[PDB]
Paper text:
SBLs neutralize β-lactams via a hydrolytically labile covalent acyl–enzyme intermediate. Here, we compare ESOC hydrolysis by the parent enzyme [name]-2 and its clinically observed double variant (P104R/V240G) [name]-4. To further study the basis for [name] activity against the ESOCs cefotaxime and ceftazidime, deacylation-deficient mutants of [name]-2 and [name]-4 were generated by conservative substitution of the general base E166 (35) with the isosteric residue Gln ([name]-2E166Q and [name]-4E166Q).
In [name]-4, however, a small change in the position of Q166 (compared with E166 in the unmodified enzyme) results in repositioning (by ∼2.4 Å) of the putative deacylating water. The positions of other active-site residues are identical to those observed in native [name]-4.
Author numbering: 25 to 57, 59 to 252, 254 to 294
The structure:
């Protein structure tokens, strides 16, 4: 049930000047679209979605975790912390930091939560605990965004991202309340309007998390999409390119998502 219908991903990545990796699963039938799906691509900020899921998983055993107030100093405010900079003088709760990390890609929030989980190895351990043997986080922000060609640090594959996203948003990896909270945070993301969402009709529900590394044409998005009248679709689109100065493209990500939905026979 893989690639029952061929789609011109090769022409798309060639026009882009790099590599595009796509894995999309129709959770009803199990049919998939797969292109470079087992190659590694840099996670960039897309790790922050799985970080929030790991926090939610811990909150199942720590009843008061999400409401715990976290205070931080100016030293914690790294570039692009649009929410946490507004609460420097007050603090924020773990839940608020998690929402900011998912919905605004807030860097200070993500760093504080990463510290809570035991750093890159702790997030990697959480992903192993749901059966993901591909994901690896190795560095803190923002060194993890280097996107060096051939470097496996801070990477996963489109397939493993999709498989893990399915487990966390639709499967049993989180308890039901935490699952729906993860979904709600993804639905509330503000940074992905020009990526997978741009391929999704306005009358369908969707949640996503973006990543943008800032070198080597490297950017990505993963999403769960609820077309009306049929089972949800989970998909991941990751890009990279050979030269440090190559620019990423949101349009290429949206276009790859359209091809994935077309390949699955989802009328959009």
């Amino acid at each position: 049930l893989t690639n029952l219908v061929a789609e011109p991903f090769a022409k798309l990545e060639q026009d882009f000047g790099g590599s595009i990796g796509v894995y999309a699963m129709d959770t009803g039938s199990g049919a998939t679209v797969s292109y470079r799906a087992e190659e590694r691509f840099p996670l960039c900020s897309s790790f922050k979605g799985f970080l929030a899921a790991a926090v939610l998983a811990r909150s199942q055993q720590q009843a008061g975790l999400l409401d715990t107030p976290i205070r931080y100093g100016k030293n914690a405010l790294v570039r692009w912390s649009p929410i946490s900079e507004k609460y420097l003088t007050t603090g924020m709760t773990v839940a608020e930091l998690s929402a900011a990390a998912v919905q605004y890609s807030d860097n200070a929030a993500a760093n504080l939560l990463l510290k809570e989980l035991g750093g890159p190895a702790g997030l990697t351990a959480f992903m192993r605990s749901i059966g993901d043997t591909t994901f690896r986080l190795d560095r803190w922000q923002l060194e993890l965004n280097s996107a060096i060609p051939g470097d496996a640090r801070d990477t996963s594959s489109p397939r493993a991202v999709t498989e893990s996203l399915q487990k966390l948003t639709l499967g049993s990896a989180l308890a039901a309340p935490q699952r729906q909270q993860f979904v709600d945070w993804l639905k509330g993301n503000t940074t992905g309007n020009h990526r997978i969402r741009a391929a999704v009709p306005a009358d369908w529900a969707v949640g996503d998390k973006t990543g943008t590394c800032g070198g080597y044409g490297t950017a990505n998005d993963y999403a769960v999409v609820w077309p009306t009248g049929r089972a949800p679709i989970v998909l991941a689109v990751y890009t990279r390119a050979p030269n440090k100065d190559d620019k990423h493209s949101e349009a290429v990500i949206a276009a790859a998502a359209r091809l994935a939905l077309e390949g699955l026979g989802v009328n959009g």
